[PDB]
Amino acid sequence: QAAVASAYQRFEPRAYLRNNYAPPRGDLCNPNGVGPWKLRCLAQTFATGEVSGRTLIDIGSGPTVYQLLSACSHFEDITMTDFLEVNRQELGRWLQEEPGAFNWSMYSQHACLIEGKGECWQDKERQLRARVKRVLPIDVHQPQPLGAGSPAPLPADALVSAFCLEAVSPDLASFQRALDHITTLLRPGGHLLLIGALEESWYLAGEARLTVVPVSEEEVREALVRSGYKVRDLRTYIMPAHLQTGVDDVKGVFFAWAQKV
Numbered sequence: 201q202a203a204v205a206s207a208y209q210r211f212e213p214r215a216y217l218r219n220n221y222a223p224p225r226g227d228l229c230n231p232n233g234v235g236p237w238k239l240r241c242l243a244q245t246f247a248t249g250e251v252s253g254r255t256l257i258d259i260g261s262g263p264t265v266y267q268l269l270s271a272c273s274h275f276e277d278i279t280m281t282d283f284l285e286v287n288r289q290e291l292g293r294w295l296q297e298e299p300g301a302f303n304w305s306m307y308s309q310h311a312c313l314i315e316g317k318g319e320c321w322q323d324k325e326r327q328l329r330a331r332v333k334r335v336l337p338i339d340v341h342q343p344q345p346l347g348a349g350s351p352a353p354l355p356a357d358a359l360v361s362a363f364c365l366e367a368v369s370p371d372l373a374s375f376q377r378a379l380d381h382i383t384t385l386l387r388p389g390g391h392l393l394l395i396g397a398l399e400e401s402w403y404l405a406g407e408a409r410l411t412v413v414p415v416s417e418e419e420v421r422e423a424l425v426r427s428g429y430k431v432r433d434l435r436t437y438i439m440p441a442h443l444q445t446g447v448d449d450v451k452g453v454f455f456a457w458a459q460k461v
């Protein structure tokens with residue numbers, strides 16, 4: 201992981217956001233787009249109402265919040281995390297509504313649209329901003345991901361992770377441990393909403409050029425099982441030609457709803 205942590209030193213938030221959350225990938229008007237698909241996944245899952253609790257931790261958040269727009273309405277205590285201060289500064293820049301904050305409103309609007317509870321998007325961002333108490337550092341490679349004195353309520357009633365594990369591990373085995381490490385932050389019976397890349401080996405972020413470990417849905421399933429989870433749901437989005445730009449070589453996106461037994 202020496203090489204890994206060494207590559208993310210050049211990782212630029214603004215470029216990453218521009219590469220994955222601005223058009224075309226950041227267009228939500230097209231129903232078949234990858235953004236609507238992800239929001240539908242989270243919305244639908246929480247819509248079952250069978251994923252609930254007090255505290256929630258977002259593993260490997262980076263500069264994005266979209267992954268919590270639906271969840272933020274089922275957990276009062278939300279803990280966001282990331283390995284780079286640079287990302288925690290960008291996140292903060294959005295949370296404290298500072299200047300130069302990324303514009304996630306398209307994603308907020310689409311979440312309100314999908315949930316169908318007549319909620320305006322300003323009110324949703326408001327609620328999300330309120331339930332996010334802290335933004336802490338994390339290293340999914342450490343046996344104890346958050347360290348020791350962490351202000352984060354452990355265990356957590358639920359964990360949310362999108363595009364992290366596979367993007368920070370050099371091999372399957374490394375990805376397999378990384379999963380276990382965060383699985384220690386969840387109480388049994390708890391839930392895991394995991395989103396990740398499929399068969400991707402690299403992606404860019406400004407000056408950074410990161411190496412990803414190419415995982416398949418079958419391997420993701422097998423690792424969840426081989427980690428103490430029951431697969432409640434496992435979905436695959438096959439990346440469409442028009443969303444295959446020069447920013448990476450991702451072939452698809454997966455969503456898994458896993459419960460720690």
Ligand SMILES: C[S@@+](CC[C@H](N)C(=O)[O-])C[C@H]1O[C@@H](n2cnc3c(N)ncnc32)[C@H](O)[C@@H]1O
Nearest residue numbers: 260261262264283284339340362363364367368
């Ligand atoms: C491709 S991004 C995912 C961003 C966001 N969660 C999303 O949905 O687009 C991977 C993130 O993992 C972070 N990261 C790097 N090394 C890490 C490590 N050792 N443990 C945990 N996260 C790490 C990076 O800083 C980056 O924000």
Ligand SMILES: O=[N+]([O-])c1ccc2c(c1)CN[C@@H](CO)C2
Nearest residue numbers: 220225234363367397403412450
């Ligand atoms: O299609 N997308 O909306 C989307 C969003 C984020 C990311 C990807 C694709 C692929 N690369 C990952 C990092 O491994 C980050």
Ligand SMILES: O=[N+]([O-])c1ccc2c(c1)CN[C@@H](CO)C2
Nearest residue numbers: 417418421430431432433434435
């Ligand atoms: O409860 N479900 O409706 C449901 C639907 C699909 C799947 C599961 C459960 C669990 N196994 C995965 C493997 O990819 C597929």
